[PDB]
Design an enzyme around this catalytic site. Structure first.
Site, PDB file in Angstrom:
ATOM      1  N   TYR B 132     108.970   3.345  19.872  1.00 44.68           N
ATOM      2  CA  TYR B 132     110.008   4.368  19.955  1.00 44.68           C
ATOM      3  C   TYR B 132     109.686   5.391  21.040  1.00 44.68           C
ATOM      4  O   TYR B 132     110.538   5.710  21.874  1.00 44.68           O
ATOM      5  CB  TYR B 132     110.160   5.082  18.602  1.00 44.68           C
ATOM      6  CG  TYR B 132     110.964   6.345  18.690  1.00 44.68           C
ATOM      7  CD1 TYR B 132     112.344   6.320  18.911  1.00 44.68           C
ATOM      8  CD2 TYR B 132     110.347   7.587  18.526  1.00 44.68           C
ATOM      9  CE1 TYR B 132     113.097   7.500  19.018  1.00 44.68           C
ATOM     10  CE2 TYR B 132     111.094   8.798  18.609  1.00 44.68           C
ATOM     11  CZ  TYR B 132     112.446   8.734  18.847  1.00 44.68           C
ATOM     12  OH  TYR B 132     113.155   9.895  18.881  1.00 44.68           O
TER      13      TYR B 132
HETATM   14  N1  LIG Z   1     115.652  14.544  14.582  1.00 45.97           N
HETATM   15  C1  LIG Z   1     114.424  14.803  15.304  1.00 45.97           C
HETATM   16  O1  LIG Z   1     113.448  15.237  14.730  1.00 45.97           O
HETATM   17  C2  LIG Z   1     114.303  14.437  16.791  1.00 45.97           C
HETATM   18  C3  LIG Z   1     113.079  14.749  17.407  1.00 45.97           C
HETATM   19  C4  LIG Z   1     112.894  14.354  18.719  1.00 45.97           C
HETATM   20  C5  LIG Z   1     113.932  13.694  19.369  1.00 45.97           C
HETATM   21  N2  LIG Z   1     115.138  13.406  18.770  1.00 45.97           N
HETATM   22  C6  LIG Z   1     116.155  12.784  19.504  1.00 45.97           C
HETATM   23  O2  LIG Z   1     117.365  13.601  19.334  1.00 45.97           O
HETATM   24  C7  LIG Z   1     118.483  12.777  19.309  1.00 45.97           C
HETATM   25  C8  LIG Z   1     119.324  13.017  18.071  1.00 45.97           C
HETATM   26  O3  LIG Z   1     118.476  12.759  16.967  1.00 45.97           O
HETATM   27  P1  LIG Z   1     119.149  12.799  15.467  1.00 45.97           P
HETATM   28  O4  LIG Z   1     118.041  13.156  14.489  1.00 45.97           O
HETATM   29  O5  LIG Z   1     120.367  13.631  15.504  1.00 45.97           O
HETATM   30  O6  LIG Z   1     119.492  11.228  15.278  1.00 45.97           O
HETATM   31  P2  LIG Z   1     120.799  10.594  14.511  1.00 45.97           P
HETATM   32  O7  LIG Z   1     120.421   9.166  14.208  1.00 45.97           O
HETATM   33  O8  LIG Z   1     121.262  11.465  13.371  1.00 45.97           O
HETATM   34  O9  LIG Z   1     121.925  10.695  15.656  1.00 45.97           O
HETATM   35  C9  LIG Z   1     121.964   9.693  16.617  1.00 45.97           C
HETATM   36  C10 LIG Z   1     123.427   9.144  16.702  1.00 45.97           C
HETATM   37  O10 LIG Z   1     123.503   8.252  17.754  1.00 45.97           O
HETATM   38  C11 LIG Z   1     124.494   7.152  17.313  1.00 45.97           C
HETATM   39  N3  LIG Z   1     124.207   6.008  18.114  1.00 45.97           N
HETATM   40  C12 LIG Z   1     123.054   5.327  18.160  1.00 45.97           C
HETATM   41  N4  LIG Z   1     123.197   4.320  19.052  1.00 45.97           N
HETATM   42  C13 LIG Z   1     124.456   4.377  19.531  1.00 45.97           C
HETATM   43  C14 LIG Z   1     125.129   3.579  20.421  1.00 45.97           C
HETATM   44  N5  LIG Z   1     124.614   2.421  21.078  1.00 45.97           N
HETATM   45  N6  LIG Z   1     126.371   3.888  20.730  1.00 45.97           N
HETATM   46  C15 LIG Z   1     127.000   4.938  20.187  1.00 45.97           C
HETATM   47  N7  LIG Z   1     126.333   5.728  19.273  1.00 45.97           N
HETATM   48  C16 LIG Z   1     125.075   5.416  18.987  1.00 45.97           C
HETATM   49  C17 LIG Z   1     124.251   7.033  15.961  1.00 45.97           C
HETATM   50  O11 LIG Z   1     125.396   6.483  15.218  1.00 45.97           O
HETATM   51  C18 LIG Z   1     123.921   8.450  15.411  1.00 45.97           C
HETATM   52  O12 LIG Z   1     125.005   9.140  14.852  1.00 45.97           O
HETATM   53  C19 LIG Z   1     117.920  11.268  19.410  1.00 45.97           C
HETATM   54  O13 LIG Z   1     117.980  10.920  20.875  1.00 45.97           O
HETATM   55  C20 LIG Z   1     116.664  11.354  19.009  1.00 45.97           C
HETATM   56  O14 LIG Z   1     115.753  10.362  19.663  1.00 45.97           O
HETATM   57  C21 LIG Z   1     115.352  13.789  17.459  1.00 45.97           C
HETATM   58  O1  LIG Z   2     108.791   9.102   3.701  1.00 47.65           O
HETATM   59  C1  LIG Z   2     108.040   9.639   4.467  1.00 47.65           C
HETATM   60  C2  LIG Z   2     108.510   9.982   5.828  1.00 47.65           C
HETATM   61  C3  LIG Z   2     107.532  10.647   6.676  1.00 47.65           C
HETATM   62  N1  LIG Z   2     106.195  10.965   6.262  1.00 47.65           N
HETATM   63  C4  LIG Z   2     105.289  11.627   7.174  1.00 47.65           C
HETATM   64  O2  LIG Z   2     105.993  12.975   7.479  1.00 47.65           O
HETATM   65  C5  LIG Z   2     105.676  13.317   8.914  1.00 47.65           C
HETATM   66  C6  LIG Z   2     107.037  13.548   9.541  1.00 47.65           C
HETATM   67  O3  LIG Z   2     107.811  12.360   9.398  1.00 47.65           O
HETATM   68  P1  LIG Z   2     109.390  12.461   9.812  1.00 47.65           P
HETATM   69  O4  LIG Z   2     110.059  13.674   9.272  1.00 47.65           O
HETATM   70  O5  LIG Z   2     109.943  11.103   9.513  1.00 47.65           O
HETATM   71  O6  LIG Z   2     109.392  12.755  11.432  1.00 47.65           O
HETATM   72  P2  LIG Z   2     108.445  12.011  12.562  1.00 47.65           P
HETATM   73  O7  LIG Z   2     108.091  10.637  12.197  1.00 47.65           O
HETATM   74  O8  LIG Z   2     107.324  12.902  12.993  1.00 47.65           O
HETATM   75  O9  LIG Z   2     109.587  11.864  13.727  1.00 47.65           O
HETATM   76  C7  LIG Z   2     110.476  12.893  14.013  1.00 47.65           C
HETATM   77  O10 LIG Z   2     109.936  13.793  15.044  1.00 47.65           O
HETATM   78  C8  LIG Z   2     109.474  12.962  16.190  1.00 47.65           C
HETATM   79  C9  LIG Z   2     108.701  13.855  17.118  1.00 47.65           C
HETATM   80  O11 LIG Z   2     109.508  14.926  17.423  1.00 47.65           O
HETATM   81  C10 LIG Z   2     110.707  12.368  16.824  1.00 47.65           C
HETATM   82  O12 LIG Z   2     110.210  11.643  17.954  1.00 47.65           O
HETATM   83  C11 LIG Z   2     111.345  11.451  15.811  1.00 47.65           C
HETATM   84  O13 LIG Z   2     112.569  10.940  16.387  1.00 47.65           O
HETATM   85  C12 LIG Z   2     111.716  12.254  14.589  1.00 47.65           C
HETATM   86  O14 LIG Z   2     112.222  11.347  13.573  1.00 47.65           O
HETATM   87  C13 LIG Z   2     104.956  12.236   9.426  1.00 47.65           C
HETATM   88  O15 LIG Z   2     103.564  12.577   9.426  1.00 47.65           O
HETATM   89  C14 LIG Z   2     105.184  10.993   8.389  1.00 47.65           C
HETATM   90  O16 LIG Z   2     104.013  10.144   8.373  1.00 47.65           O
HETATM   91  C15 LIG Z   2     105.714  10.613   4.920  1.00 47.65           C
HETATM   92  O17 LIG Z   2     104.623  10.907   4.577  1.00 47.65           O
HETATM   93  N2  LIG Z   2     106.700   9.955   4.081  1.00 47.65           N
END
Ligand SMILES: NC(=O)c1ccc[n+]([C@@H]2O[C@H](COP(=O)([O-])OP(=O)(O)OC[C@H]3O[C@@H](n4cnc5c(N)ncnc54)[C@H](O)[C@@H]3O)[C@@H](O)[C@H]2O)c1
Ligand SMILES: O=c1ccn([C@@H]2O[C@H](COP(=O)(O)OP(=O)(O)O[C@H]3O[C@H](CO)[C@@H](O)[C@H](O)[C@H]3O)[C@@H](O)[C@H]2O)c(=O)[nH]1
Ligand SMILES: NC(=O)c1ccc[n+]([C@@H]2O[C@H](COP(=O)([O-])OP(=O)(O)OC[C@H]3O[C@@H](n4cnc5c(N)ncnc54)[C@H](O)[C@@H]3O)[C@@H](O)[C@H]2O)c1
Ligand SMILES: O=c1ccn([C@@H]2O[C@H](COP(=O)(O)OP(=O)(O)O[C@H]3O[C@H](CO)[C@@H](O)[C@H](O)[C@H]3O)[C@@H](O)[C@H]2O)c(=O)[nH]1
Lengths: 299, 299
Positions: B132
């Site tokens: 990822y």
């Molecule tokens: N949530 C976090 O902690 C976090 C941290 C770091 C980076 N990001 C990045 O931020 C962005 C948003 O994250 P999020 O938590 O809102 O994820 P999310 O899964 O809630 O939102 C992503 C959306 O993209 C849509 N999507 C995926 N592939 C698609 C495609 N081929 N065509 C059209 N739509 C598509 C999905 O339906 C979904 O609604 C992502 O790029 C993710 O990698 C999130």
């Molecule tokens: O059921 C669960 C899910 C997660 N974790 C742990 O909780 C921490 C956070 O996990 P999670 O909230 O799933 O976020 P990350 O895996 O750290 O990933 C988030 O934050 C990353 C860094 O910003 C982004 O790259 C990812 O897209 C986003 O999902 C991690 O240490 C996991 O190992 C557990 O112990 N049990």
């Protein structure tokens, strides 16, 4: 143990196969194209279709050279570049973990540096200028991520090659096209004004670096430039080829291609300290080797 | 001009859509899932199937949030992660060049840093530990390569988010699962011993950073961490949730998952200087917002 080379039918791969066998190593060659003391076993297939764990039976060292290597087509062929350069790499590395391979030497590229004047060092942030460079950066980072898994006893040597030439060079590359423009009068287009520079590295040196990299087994993973540290312009290569042959290269100047970096120059220091590798062949000597090979090849 | 948000049905995207419209901007939303003063036009489709240039008619700013965002499935779903996170990005950026979009704000991730103790700075070499993270690094480098094309009048702000939480958090994330383990008794597994740390950033702050990034239009491209600079352990989040609710979280400790980094902490300096962005919400306050939203959501 035995060694497996992916991309073994290609330019660098075929030279590496020769040196591995001459050194006494048994080689398993994998390529989807036919191959041109150690034994040789040819496996014909696509990395995205073969049973890779089966191919890796009794393999202790993998040289991963297979890829689509052209900078310029990568803008308009991106699905295939992702499939061959990134997906195939991911599949191969998973199979390496599953098969207990000890060391994987991955061909990366100076293309990960993108545009930069002067020396490109392994501590510089990658900033590729083409989708091809993005795929090579992704392949090398994937390889390192697999080597860092807690369940893997796997090291990776990722080698950032600088524009490789010599006998057998791929025909889409500049020096190969220029030599056909010279010996056979088939025109080559110059992409821009010819003042662009490249660190051109002879394939014999690259093969020595590949072998050295595989032999470093107890020092974890490494990311190393493989180049000469000397850059030469396209126009200067044209003038050298004219001088060597007494035939006027059939050239036509055209527009620069987006994605081509203006200059490459390898920082050669880390490969010298980690591998004991210093390139031995300069362009004037190496260019003559490719010209002579090409004559005999056309006859 | 109007603004287009990819991934607009998701967690961060839906919050961004709300703020864009409240600010008076007309929004075009693109997602393959249904959406939960500025107008809103919903386009339902996959980025790999839609006519993206048509979607980008009269669009001056794109927020590219669509992706498959989970760290852990990326080892076993790599074709889909490449397709959604890298191929779709490449297609979108080409269409942005063709449509004359001025600025693209790309969601990247702290996952590009991989494993590191202490502060993760934008000058550190990326070394993702999961496939990822490799795909997010590839997406952000692709975006920068398109912005560097000589034929593009295009800038990119690439934002490396740090583990975002709050109202609407995706249900696969830890804090969402823990809150269901607390309010509803649905057990959450802890992946390892709970001593892992994360820089947890509230979604309201992330949306402010996204808006600020889009408004920087005459300074070229930028790569910026978006986080708080404060890391909290998984075990500490469990204890805070117990304290806030007076209900014992239903937890079970299990094995660490390969690919999970041990700790994240954002260097917050460059986003403060480039954007004027400093996170305002700390975890104790933000955690309460998510708990309260989740109560009302379940009722
Ligand atoms: N949530 C976090 O902690 C976090 C941290 C770091 C980076 N990001 C990045 O931020 C962005 C948003 O994250 P999020 O938590 O809102 O994820 P999310 O899964 O809630 O939102 C992503 C959306 O993209 C849509 N999507 C995926 N592939 C698609 C495609 N081929 N065509 C059209 N739509 C598509 C999905 O339906 C979904 O609604 C992502 O790029 C993710 O990698 C999130
Ligand atoms: O059921 C669960 C899910 C997660 N974790 C742990 O909780 C921490 C956070 O996990 P999670 O909230 O799933 O976020 P990350 O895996 O750290 O990933 C988030 O934050 C990353 C860094 O910003 C982004 O790259 C990812 O897209 C986003 O999902 C991690 O240490 C996991 O190992 C557990 O112990 N049990
Ligand atoms: N030649 C250079 O200047 C140079 C510079 C930097 C990096 N590299 C890298 O070095 C490596 C070798 O380069 P080369 O010039 O020998 O290229 P090449 O095209 O001659 O060799 C690559 C080989 O890989 C095979 N291949 C491609 N995809 C395959 C797949 N899915 N399954 C099985 N086989 C597949 C091809 O048939 C070909 O024989 C490449 O990884 C390339 O990116 C080369
Ligand atoms: O017909 C041609 C082909 C190339 N060039 C120019 O010649 C230089 C070298 O081109 P080429 O020999 O095709 O190599 P590169 O494009 O620099 O790429 C090679 O070297 C890169 C950096 O090492 C690797 O990433 C690539 O895989 C490898 O093909 C470049 O400035 C081209 O613009 C022309 O002018 N006309």
């Amino acid at each position: 143990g035995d060694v497996l080379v992916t991309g073994a039918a290609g330019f660098i791969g075929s030279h590496l196969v020769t040196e591995l066998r001459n050194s006494g190593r048994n080689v398993v060659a994998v390529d989807r194209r036919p191959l041109p003391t150690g034994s040789l076993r040819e496996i014909r297939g696509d990395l995205n279709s073969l049973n890779l764990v089966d191919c890796l039976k009794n393999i202790s060292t993998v040289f991963h050279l297979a890829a689509l290597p052209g900078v310029r087509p990568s803008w308009t062929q991106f699905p295939e570049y992702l499939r061959c350069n990134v997906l195939a790499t991911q599949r191969l590395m998973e199979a390496c973990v599953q098969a207990g391979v000890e060391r994987v030497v991955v061909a990366s590229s100076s293309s990960v540096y993108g545009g930069a004047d002067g020396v490109m060092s392994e501590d510089d942030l990658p900033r590729p200028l083409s989708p091809y460079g993005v795929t090579k950066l992704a392949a090398e980072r994937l390889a390192l991520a697999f080597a860092a898994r807690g369940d893997a006893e796997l090291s990776v040597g990722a080698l950032r090659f600088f524009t490789v030439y010599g006998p057998g060079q791929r025909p889409d590359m500049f020096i190969s096209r220029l030599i056909r423009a010279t010996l056979r009068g088939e025109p080559v287009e110059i992409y821009g004004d010819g003042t662009q520079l490249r660190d051109f590295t002879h394939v014999s040196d690259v093969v020595r670096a590949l072998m050295l990299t595989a032999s470093v087994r107890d020092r974890g993973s490494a990311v190393l430039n493989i180049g000469t540290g000397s850059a030469v312009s396209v126009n200067e290569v044209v003038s050298m080829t004219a001088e060597l042959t007494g035939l006027r290269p059939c050239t036509a100047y055209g527009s620069a291609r987006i994605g081509d970096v203006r200059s490459t120059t390898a920082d050669v220091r880390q490969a010298q300290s980690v591998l004991g590798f210093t390139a031995r062949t300069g362009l004037r000597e190496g260019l003559a080797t490719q010209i002579e090979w090409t004559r005999r090849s056309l006859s």
